[PDB]
DNA sequence: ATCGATCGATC
DNA sequence: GATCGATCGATAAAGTTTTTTTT
């Protein structure tokens with residue numbers, strides 16, 4: 272390599288000013304790895320070259336990285352490895368790149384392919400839904416002759432070097448080298464690496480409807496494994512690459528494609544459209560916005576700026592979405608620290624409107640729509656052979672609902688399969704099944720949001736208020752709040768309605784989502800010896816006034832009456848259970864029961 | 866009651882149990898009482914978990 | 921990649 | 932004509948959730 276190395280050589284003296292600002296960063300991350308591990312009684316090798324600093328004073332060295340990125344990456348590795356030992360070697364893994372920056376119109380949505388930038392750089396976004404296995408793989412073993420006591424050294428290349436077209440080495444353990452020594456190999460002195468195949472869908476909103484969502488796939492490496500949950504808005508960028516032999520294999524390969532498009536990539540980025548950083552300024556404003564004695568009322572009407580009223584409902588959603596704690600019993604069954612509300616209403620009264628705008632501020636809570644299929648909380652042994660001979664229990668919809676919220680529609684308009692499905696997973700936090708394989712108790716902290724319609728028209732006043740839809744009352748007993756939405760005619764109400772549907776054809780949301788996702792990580796009081804005294808007076812009267820009124824209650828309803836006020840103090844962001852929380856919890860039930 | 870791992874070696878040759886136990890406390894105390902002898906003694910618990918199967 | 925069968929060359 | 936050696940060709944893979952009428 273003489274002439275193919277001089278521009279590689281010229282880069283080695285060039286970009287040392289580009290990491291004038293990173294030559295500290297490359298060594299400072301590993302001196303504490305030489306100090307955490309030496310004093311136990313941890314980070315990968317990630318070197319974020321900004322594209323700006325390379326673009327700012329180089330053109331020919333820059334232009335090749337977006338035209339022919341197949342001769343130019345093991346240059347930048349080769350300078351980088353010798354600037355690690357020459358920095359630090361005295362205390363007694365090639366430091367590959369990450370390559371973040373901007374790109375200038377390479378946001379190819381994989382519904383579209385390339386015709387010109389094949390084998391180039393490409394930025395790709397979307398959602399992943401495949402999440403296949405994890406499995407190690409060698410790169411190099413170290414043979415050893417026991418007789419004469421001397422080692423050997425051999426590398427085995429694969430489709431993981433990403434750029435060079437190496438002659439493959441399909442050998443597993445080449446034994447008996449040119450000697451008479453029965454060979455050994457110190458596998459602890461060997462080295463290994465892993466693979467993970469994941470397919471990415473299309474974000475199904477900016478793809479115009481003339482096709483179903485397509486998909487491609489990406490092979491990544493050790494640094495970013497177990498990072499992507501199924502259901503994350505991910506952003507990845509790597510090289511484009513074809514492999515395999517096709518079309519001109521030995522015989523009879525007619526009308527068979529032979530170029531598997533792959534991506535060998537880096538820098539998997541989550542996005543939000545957990546990463547929400549905040550300075551001292553905005554964290555102090557929410558302390559200043561924790562100060563007033565009205566913030567539970569201001570946050571209620573600042574949520575859905577299209578619909579009038581229902582402030583009992585509008586407080587309930589924000590009370591539910593932030594959620595309450597579950598103190599797990601030591602050597603005992605934890606109770607239902609989740610909360611599960613329900614709605615029902617005579618039709619076209621926005622009972623389904625507010626169920627889907629919670630999904631925009633979901634904070635990684637992707638819900639379904641409730642289609643009559645088994646798979647709501649199971650797998651039913653879908654394996655697809657897991658690349659020829661492995662069986663996996665691929666999770667349907669409970670790997671996503673953990674510490675999140677879901678919502679489903681048309682409860683009464685289902686078959687019998689979901690009725691036994693929501694039976695177990697409500698009284699029990701988990702599910703366990705051996706469909707065709709093994710029992711496995713995988714856990715899930717989830718909470719439903721319901722919606723249903725009464726069958727017999729406008730009959731919610733002339734008949735029994737209970738037994739009203741006759742879906743099994745085990746679920747009615749396992750839920751608490753059954754709001755009956757009224758739509759009676761008031762001549763000032765509909766007059767006010769008539770203008771608010773006209774002024775919608777043209778204190779804020781991102782501050783709201785930051786508030787709850789900061790208040791999910793602070794303290795939990797649970798304790799005031801007199802706030803617990805007022806609520807039992809506030810229950811035993813209606814425990815004697817349950818059959819003399821419309822609805823009978825149960826003993827588990829007492830666990831609601833702590834749980835609502837428990838999260839109501841989380842709105843206050845205080846380590847004390849106050850007294851004022853035992854007044855909102857009273858009258859909210861008093862509207863749900865009278 | 867001398868070399869106790871050799872004492873367990875006697876209770877196997879007469880064929881009543883086929884499991885010896887070469888633990889680490891009989892290696893570190895073997896190195897604790899080799900701390901005072903100022904000679905080059907390489908680390909043992911390293912190599913038996915740097916590459917365990919050659920032991 | 922390994923094993924078996926067939927063909928060719930040499931003794 | 933028979934035996935031995937070398938070269939070329941052939942041989943190994945796996946299943947069990949949606950949907951129809953029907954009782």
Ligand SMILES: Nc1ncnc2c1ncn2[C@@H]1O[C@H](COP(=O)(O)OP(=O)(O)OP(=O)(O)O)[C@@H](O)[C@H]1O
Nearest residue numbers: 577578579617618619620621622623624625724772
């Ligand atoms: N009570 C209401 N106040 C204000 N707007 C309303 C109300 N009810 C309906 N709307 C308007 O109706 C539109 C959509 O209503 P929506 O489709 O959610 O009814 P729905 O809840 O689906 O009824 P159902 O679930 O019975 O079909 C919204 O744009 C909303 O502005």
